[PDB]
Amino acid sequence: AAKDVKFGNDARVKMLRGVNVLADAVKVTLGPKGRNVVLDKSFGAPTITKDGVSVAREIELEDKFENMGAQMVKEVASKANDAAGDGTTTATVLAQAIITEGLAAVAAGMNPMDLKRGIDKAVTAAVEELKALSVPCSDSKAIAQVGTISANSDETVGKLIAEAMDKVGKEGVITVEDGTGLQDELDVVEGMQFDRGYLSPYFINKPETGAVELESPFILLADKKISNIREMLPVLEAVAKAGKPLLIIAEDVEGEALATLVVNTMRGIVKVAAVKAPGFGDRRKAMLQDIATLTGGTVISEEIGMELEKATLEDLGQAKRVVINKDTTTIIDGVGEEAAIQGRVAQIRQQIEEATSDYDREKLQERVAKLAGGVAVIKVGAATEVEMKEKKARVEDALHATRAAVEEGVVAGGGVALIRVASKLADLRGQNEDQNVGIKVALRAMEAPLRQIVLNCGEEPSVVANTVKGGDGNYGYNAATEEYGNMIDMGILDPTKVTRSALQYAASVAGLMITTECMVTDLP
Amino acid sequence: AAKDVKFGNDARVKMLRGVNVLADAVKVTLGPKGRNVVLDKSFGAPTITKDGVSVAREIELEDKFENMGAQMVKEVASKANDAAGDGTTTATVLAQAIITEGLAAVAAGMNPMDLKRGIDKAVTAAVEELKALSVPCSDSKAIAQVGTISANSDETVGKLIAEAMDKVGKEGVITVEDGTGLQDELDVVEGMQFDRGYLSPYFINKPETGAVELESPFILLADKKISNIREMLPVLEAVAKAGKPLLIIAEDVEGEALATLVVNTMRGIVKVAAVKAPGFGDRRKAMLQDIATLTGGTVISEEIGMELEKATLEDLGQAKRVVINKDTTTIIDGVGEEAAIQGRVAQIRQQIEEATSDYDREKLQERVAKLAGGVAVIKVGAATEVEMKEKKARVEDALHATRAAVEEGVVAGGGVALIRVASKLADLRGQNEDQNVGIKVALRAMEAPLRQIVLNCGEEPSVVANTVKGGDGNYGYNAATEEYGNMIDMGILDPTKVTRSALQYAASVAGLMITTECMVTDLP
Amino acid sequence: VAGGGVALIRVASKLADLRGQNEDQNVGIKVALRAMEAPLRQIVLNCGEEPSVVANTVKGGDGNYGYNAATEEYGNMIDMGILDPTKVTRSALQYAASVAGLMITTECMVTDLP
Amino acid sequence: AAKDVKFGNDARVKMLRGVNVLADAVKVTLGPKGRNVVLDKSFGAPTITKDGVSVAREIELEDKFENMGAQMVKEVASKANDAAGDGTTTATVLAQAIITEGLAAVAAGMNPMDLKRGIDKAVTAAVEELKALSVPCSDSKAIAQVGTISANSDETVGKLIAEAMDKVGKEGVITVEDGTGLQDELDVVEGMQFDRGYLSPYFINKPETGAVELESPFILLADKKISNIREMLPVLEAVAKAGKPLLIIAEDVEGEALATLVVNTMRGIVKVAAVKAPGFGDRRKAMLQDIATLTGGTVISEEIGMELEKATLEDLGQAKRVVINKDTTTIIDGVGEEAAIQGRVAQIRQQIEEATSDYDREKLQERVAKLAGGVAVIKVGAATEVEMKEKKARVEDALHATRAAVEEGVVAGGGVALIRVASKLADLRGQNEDQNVGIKVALRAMEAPLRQIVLNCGEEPSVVANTVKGGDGNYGYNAATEEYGNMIDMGILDPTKVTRSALQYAASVAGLMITTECMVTDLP
């Protein structure tokens, strides 16, 4: 198609304008005094929300260049929430601050590349100071406290998360499902989790979390790439008959088969979802067999001369639930008999001994950890379902937050960590003056979220900022109570992982935009 | 699609103009001297109505932002009518008053959140004062009186209702249906009512009542989430023969299945409605079986491996009638054997003995209450179908009003209760000045309905308001007769519940609009 | 009195308990008190410093303590030789309020046609 | 009249565009390879010129704001030529550089006042480095070299100027006239010069110099301020007979009288020009009397009761020539008797013995130096009238430059003094970073003239700039011969006074414009 090509200053102003729409929309929601955004729906009543992730999702602009800006920040910022379970909005206001100052500078005649290098130096430093400020969360006393705080002072939720983590370990797999009737339950079931996400959205049956959820599905395990639905049909009919869901695991699923499957389950014919088999090379075949043992299926490989058309319901594995992310798949309550599974574990566990290589040994260890590890399942009861769904939501958010803490610790929330960390870097320098301007740009940017929060409250951002900078450690401003003090003690905190991800991703995309000299889109 | 995004002042005035159209259209109908609204139809001659709910239903605006506004108040205000059987028009004029003043204040530079907090404080204060002002309706004399007043002073109607409540209790389930000839009938039948409403509008075949009404329908009881109508087809085609309607009670009806159900029943192919199964977890399955017994159907649960395709007409339950609200499902005259039903009752009642907890007990007592309780059916007699249909309608309204009265009592109608209550709160204060302005905003808005009624009467609203503020208790202005005095004595009253509801939902949606800083909609 | 507008903001900071006959009157009072911060906020603004912060710091101290905008230094304004005659500050405030009062109470304007 | 008022950023770009037209116009004339600018005249053929002053005089822009900018730099830059006899184009290109960069910085959010401070520091430091870099012009051999170089290498002009200064001293008054024939002449005559200029333009009959030149005029001396032309009329008519011009020396000539004089001398009858009496107070009356003695006139003062109405041709003074600048009046060959003049010298010289105060001693010394010192008249001869006029011009120019050189010395021309100095100041810092940017702005600005010159020569500006920055002292680029070397040795030089003046006035106006936040003009 004939394109429209814009260069330099213009490309930059269009982009700025697009992200300004995006950020100005999302940042009104920041903090406890945050405002509402109303999002129209063609059918039904409009949606009222304080959730900036939702708001971001809705933003698309008419002008193509402006939309490019908005969509760039939108995506890279999504990556923050994806990593730590939170921080997308923050990533966004940071991005907006850095880009505004950065562009100002570039247009003022400073070198885009030197500015980017300075920004990134400042960010690296900031992440280290962040490691310094972080308060560790390690014994389950801290664990339960953190979960509790994230649950909005529900101590039951803290007790719960901590019990789960002690049962399955801190790195162990934990699931949440609806409760049976007002008492919580906790059980370890046969299960596994690996890093492969859906091969396409539209498989998503749980739009809140953006995930795939299947109950008691059969699971198809085939070691080959599946490009054509011609091989699949008999197994698909056995699955149409047994009226159960189905999970496809292959070397990959592409093209004809992929489109036909998406179209098919979206039209409600034979509900199916597909993900890639984990890993590559020989360990791919092996892990495929591991999952087979866990779920009680048989791997179908062309290598042994097995064909997918002659495959039946019997060759398949099975489990009670599966949940699939953008990047993660979790298999819950697998049917495979205990003999097969623990004997397989013994095999691999002996392979750990016979290991001639450190790498190989560790790969085998990963495998036994997953297979033998099992899955923690929290069933949330409330007495009257409303209270249950609410609590359950609270439990899931708290869980993500607690995992982030368990990994990297917690820091003062409400953006005082960022403004703190930033207050310490004033002496930071680069290789030349442009680099230095880049550094100062980022430091000023780290003041943005706290200032937005303070603004939504009707207070003067510069004064609050001044007071917080004047103090030390985790000293900051509690926007909720309008009270200064120690932010951890006052129970206002973010996982260190969350703030780090927010700043890093923000700075990444801002750097990319600051260094963009040309844009290409289609003509209207 | 590409969006249009508005901020702050711009979006707020937009919203304001939208709710002003809705309210101004709706409030012309208020009071005894209320005016007519003419609603166009593509087919035939237009509708002339004094009913503000219908008017509300019709309002949709050309401007997307303005439409969002109107739709918001429409949605939250509709709820008062949902709860109390009345109060939606009131809620809307109340809301308009709160919104106009509130946004006015916001526009002056006051803190939106503080305005909100102050409004909510005045509303809490007010609901309490309403309980203070409230007059109990307890004995069946007063009950019959309230009924007679809601039927437009038809004592037959009062007599009938009081007789119904005496047969099934004040909390008991009561129904109204067409009569078999001139004279009324009253019968108690096996039946149940639980709080789950239609899973979608468009299921409504009776727009006067905002209800779904099905005669001699089949009932499908499934313990499953139903996502795919392919599962339904044998059952739906089987129900398409025998030419009877179908009620789906399941864990939920989602996506494809729901969409197809809506479409099919709206194109007249098979009349169908879907509702959520009551409760959650295990006791959900228990109640489902309760319903199954009541209707002589069979619950289809995946747990033992039953599939919906393998369901036949015989697995379906039946009743002479079902009625579905937004929040309610009521089943009338089930086919279930008296032996079966009574045996299930016996079982639950012994389960009550072994109960190791009060919680378990109260839940069971609720269940046997429903099952053993049955349903009162009032058949309205007339002589000439026209008179019957009319009287029936009046009986329904009176029924709803009387139930609202038995629950929370009655207070002086004509919007004078609200203004009385506001006069008692003149000293109410907040944490700061903006909070105080919010309070005064609410107190002043509470004068709006009365003031409107009086305007429609062609009288001077301020003078009447002033005179009413000057008196005490249930002293107020009777607009029909242009007479001041004791409003309860004059038979002009509202259930305390509907006035409460109107005020609360009004303040709710108003609070939300006052805190909206951004709106996102599609492009024209 | 202390110049650079700190006399007006001092004076204003002492009147926080001033109340009128009703709420609109109360609003009148706060409008005017808040207005008295305007000259220093402006002075500070032209200097490229943050008006709100300086204002804040000045209100916190007492007497003729204020901000010297020339030197960016806090202290005793009079001791720093920075002052206005009391008469000029009064006249500025009083006349300002006079015309402002008149404009606020103006309901109609008549001028010739273009 | 109603005004158009622009603020801030908008106003600044208006100014920027205005000085951009002026400068881009003037700066093409700069190199020895400088280009031509063509100036339309309504009657006859257009003017082809390389004189940037001439170009500047013509520039007036349609947009009132753009015009304000242009006129600002135009006026203060004119002040440079006025001080040193040269440097106006330089001042203008310098100003354009500083304004462009400075406003860039301001728009990027740097403090206007701090940028001004930084610029002003850099210039003060630079003027010092310029003084260090300066070469003295002291012995008359050096004086003759400077004159010769300024004369386009005519050793005759150097000879002339040196002989002239030797006749009258370094500070003595020197004038140039038409020669009476081939082979120049020099004579010292009775004459004087004091610093008072015309009281108004439009008195100018010599637009080339922008000066007043009157031949054999009458001189009026009044110790009064003249507000009304009625007192003047008999005197104006007395001057009207004998058909000679008239010089007014008074306390002042104001309002009606001055306007009427400008007007009358503009209609071509009664050619007259007016100036203030030199000095003020009592020393002014004394000095007036000195001029009276020199010219053989009589002071007319009201103190002794003399009135202008009774003044005749006899009271009027006389001289062979008078020349009046914007800032200077010089009177050449007065009719006063040698006795009168030398006797007045004796009066004052005896007053010097009696002085009990040093200040008075200095003032009297000033007066006898002026009186007894006389005026040098250089009469320039050549072969043909044309050659004579050409040479006369070369002599006038050379004299300006040589005077400037005797005062402050010479520095490397071709704009390399500026770029040299700038290279010496690279380490200079201010009180904060904004001040630093100010400093770098001015330093960068100092390269602009040389860069312009190299561009006009068709060579690469960055490259030449660089090579000159690499050497030391008076090392630079000769644009004419495209040869690098020692600029003074190659005979390419500017008086230190003109380069200094240029940089200072340029930075002056630039400083003002950068700190301009509001512009006010008339409506179109």
Swiss-Prot record, chains A, B, D:
Residues that hold ATP according to the record: 29-32, 50, 86-90, 414, 478-480, 494
Phenotype when changing A108C: Forms inter-ring disulfide bonds. Prevents ring separation and leads to the formation of high amounts of symmetric GroEL:GroES2 complexes
InterPro entries: Chaperonin_Cpn60_CS, Cpn60/GroEL, Cpn60/GroEL/TCP-1, GroEL-like_apical_dom_sf, GROEL-like_equatorial_sf, TCP-1-like_intermed_sf
Catalytic activity: ATP + H2O + a folded polypeptide = ADP + phosphate + an unfolded polypeptide
Biological-process GO terms, alphabetical: chaperone cofactor-dependent protein refolding; protein folding; protein refolding; response to heat; response to radiation; virion assembly
Regulation: During the substrate-folding cycle, the two GroEL rings separate for effective substrate binding and chaperonin activity. Ring separation is triggered by ATP binding to the trans ring of the asymmetric GroEL:GroES complex and avoids formation of functionally impaired symmetric GroEL:GroES2 complexes. Activity of the GroEL-GroES chaperonin complex requires Mg-ATP. UMPylation of the chaperone by SelO/YdiU negatively regulates its activity, and may facilitate survival under stress conditions.
Domain topic, free-text comment: Each subunit is composed of an apical domain that binds non-folded proteins and GroES, an intermediate domain and an equatorial domain that binds ATP and is involved in inter-ring interactions. Forms a large central channel that appears to traverse the entire length of the cylinder with no obstruction. The central channel of GroEL functions as two cavities, one in each ring, that are separated from each other by the crystallographically disordered 23-amino-acid C-terminal segments of the seven subunits. The entry and exit of polypeptide seem to be restricted to the apical end of each ring.
Oligomer status and interactors: Forms a cylinder of 14 subunits composed of two heptameric rings stacked back-to-back. Interacts with the co-chaperonin GroES. Can form asymmetrical complexes, composed of one GroEL and one GroES, and symmetrical complexes, formed between one GroEL and two GroES oligomers. The asymmetrical complex is the functional unit. It was suggested that the symmetric heterooligomer may represent a transient intermediate in the chaperonin protein folding cycle.
UniProt-recorded name of the protein: Chaperonin GroEL
Provenance organism: Escherichia coli (strain K12)
UniProtKB/Swiss-Prot annotation, chain C:
Post-translational modification: Phosphorylated reversibly during heat shock. Can be UMPylated on a tyrosine residue by SelO/YdiU, probably under stress conditions.
Subcellular location: Cytoplasm
Phenotypic consequence of E50K: Temperature-sensitive lethal mutant. At nonpermissive temperature, the rate of general translation is reduced and a defined group of cytoplasmic proteins are translated but fail to reach native form
Ranges that cross the membrane: none
Binding-site residues, ATP: G4, N68, A69, A70, D84
Superkingdom: Bacteria
Domain notes: Each subunit is composed of an apical domain that binds non-folded proteins and GroES, an intermediate domain and an equatorial domain that binds ATP and is involved in inter-ring interactions. Forms a large central channel that appears to traverse the entire length of the cylinder with no obstruction. The central channel of GroEL functions as two cavities, one in each ring, that are separated from each other by the crystallographically disordered 23-amino-acid C-terminal segments of the seven subunits. The entry and exit of polypeptide seem to be restricted to the apical end of each ring. Modulating the volume of the GroEL central cavity affects folding speed in accordance with confinement theory. Small proteins fold more rapidly as the size of the cage is gradually reduced to a point where restriction in space slows folding dramatically. For larger proteins, either expanding or reducing cage volume decelerate folding. A stepwise reduction in cage size results in a gradual loss of cell viability.
Summary of the function given for this chain in its UniProt record: Together with its co-chaperonin GroES, plays an essential role in assisting protein folding. The GroEL-GroES system forms a nano-cage that allows encapsulation of the non-native substrate proteins and provides a physical environment optimized to promote and accelerate protein folding, probably by preventing aggregation and by entropically destabilizing folding intermediates. Also plays a role in coupling between replication of the F plasmid and cell division of the cell.
Subunit structure of this chain's protein: Forms a cylinder of 14 subunits composed of two heptameric rings stacked back-to-back. Interacts with the co-chaperonin GroES. Can form asymmetrical complexes, composed of one GroEL and one GroES, and symmetrical complexes, formed between one GroEL and two GroES oligomers. The asymmetrical complex is the functional unit. It was suggested that the symmetric heterooligomer may represent a transient intermediate in the chaperonin protein folding cycle.
Protein family per UniProt: Belongs to the chaperonin (HSP60) family.
Full protein name: Chaperonin GroEL
Species whose genome carries this gene: Escherichia coli (strain K12)
Residues of the full protein shown: 412 to 525 of 548
